[PDB]
Every structure is written in structure tokens, then in C-alpha cells.
Design a protein around this ligand. Structure first.
Ligand SMILES: Nc1nc2c(ncn2[C@@H]2O[C@H](COP(=O)(O)OP(=O)(O)O)[C@@H](O)[C@H]2O)c(=O)[nH]1
Length: 166
């Protein structure tokens, strides 16, 4: 029936959440810097085709906080973003997941953002891939909006599909 799926994008400050939203709007990192708006938008929506069917993904950029409200938790799919160049970024995703999403039926996708940069060891007891396995998530999906042309919309197809068939 419904073809608009809500996705909460979660991660530490400057882990690249805003970049993910802008990428859904077809803007790479270069154009994101050229753009100047009166106010930054923490929501973004765009068309996402799944199996030839027109769907829409509504992204909600959740700014970093030690605590999330039920308003920031309810969604069709959660996108946990960490920065491959920030060794402290994944711990936040893992903590938020266990605290708010582990005991729910909301599908979760982990995104390794800024994949264009050089990977560093994450300061967490578990590796990102092991964490996904333990909690029955897909593998961490590499992502970058730092491209010559429009960023790849692969993660958005994935997020939308996961939301469709929870
Ligand atoms: N190299 C690189 N830098 C990025 C990427 N995405 C964001 N950044 C930079 O990382 C910083 C934080 O990004 P932003 O999207 O504002 O993070 P947010 O605070 O989580 O929304 C900015 O200086 C961005 O230009 C990416 O894919 N690659």
C-alpha cells in the first residue's frame, strides 16, 4: 500500500550523515560545499526504484546524542553510519543500536561512510563485520559521496528494500 519508507540516519558528529542525505538528492561532496542555504535540512526524500517499482525513501538525519526519543527511533529501517577514518565512530552506532534498536523488529543497515578515505581500526571490542553477524544484519556497506559525478544510490536501494520486506 504505502510506498514512502522512513529511515533514521544515526552516527556521531561529522561522520557524514549530511553527506548521505545530500547523496540521495544526487549531490556529491563537491556540490555539497558549493551549495549555500539559509538553513541546513535534516530531512531528505527522493525516488528509489526497487524491482522496477517506484518507491520513496525519507531520510531523517539524527544529530548525535547520548539519548534518542521514541520519535527518533520509530522508522521503517535504521541506517547506522560510522566514519572509516574515525576510530571512535562505530562505538556510538553499536551503543545506540543495543540501547534502542536491538529489542525491536526494525531492520538495520550499517554504512561505512567516507570509504574514499583510509580505513583505521575501530576502538570497539567487536569488529564491524562481526557485529553485523551477531545481530543478523547485512555486512557493513561501504559508502562515499566524494565522487566525480552523482554518488551511488546503492545503499538507498538496499535501505528501501529492507524497509519493504522487514
Ligand atoms: N572525504 C570525505 N569527506 C566527507 C564525506 N562525507 C563528508 N565528508 C566531510 O566530513 C565532514 C562532516 O560531514 P557531514 O556530512 O557534515 O557530517 P554529519 O555532521 O554527520 O552530518 C565535512 O567536512 C564533510 O565535507 C565523504 O564521503 N568523503
Amino acid at each position: 500500500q504505502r510506498n514512502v519508507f522512513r529511515c533514521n540516519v544515526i552516527g556521531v558528529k561529522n561522520c557524514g550523515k549530511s553527506g548521505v542525505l545530500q547523496a540521495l538528492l544526487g549531490r556529491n561532496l563537491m556540490r555539497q560545499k558549493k551549495i549555500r542555504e539559509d538553513h541546513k535540512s535534516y530531512y531528505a526524500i527522493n525516488t528509489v526504484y526497487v524491482y522496477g517499482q517506484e518507491k520513496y525513501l525519507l531520510l531523517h538525519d539524527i544529530s548525535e546524542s547520548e539519548f534518542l526519543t521514541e520519535a527518533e527511533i520509530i522508522c521503517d529501517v535504521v541506517c547506522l553510519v560510522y566514519d572509516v577514518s574515525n576510530p571512535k565512530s562505530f562505538e556510538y552506532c553499536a551503543r545506540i543500536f543495543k540501547q534502542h534498536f536491538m529489542d525491536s523488529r526494525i531492520p538495520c543497515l550499517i554504512v561505512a561512510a567516507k570509504s574514499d578515505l583510509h580505513e583505521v581500526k575501530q576502538e570497539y571490542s567487536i569488529s564491524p563485520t562481526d557485529f553485523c553477524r551477531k545481530h543478523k544484519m547485512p555486512p557493513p556497506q561501504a559508502f562515499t559521496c566524494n565522487t566525480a559525478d552523482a554518488p551511488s544510490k546503492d545503499i538507498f536501494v538496499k535501505l528501501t528494500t529492507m524497509a519493504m520486506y522487514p
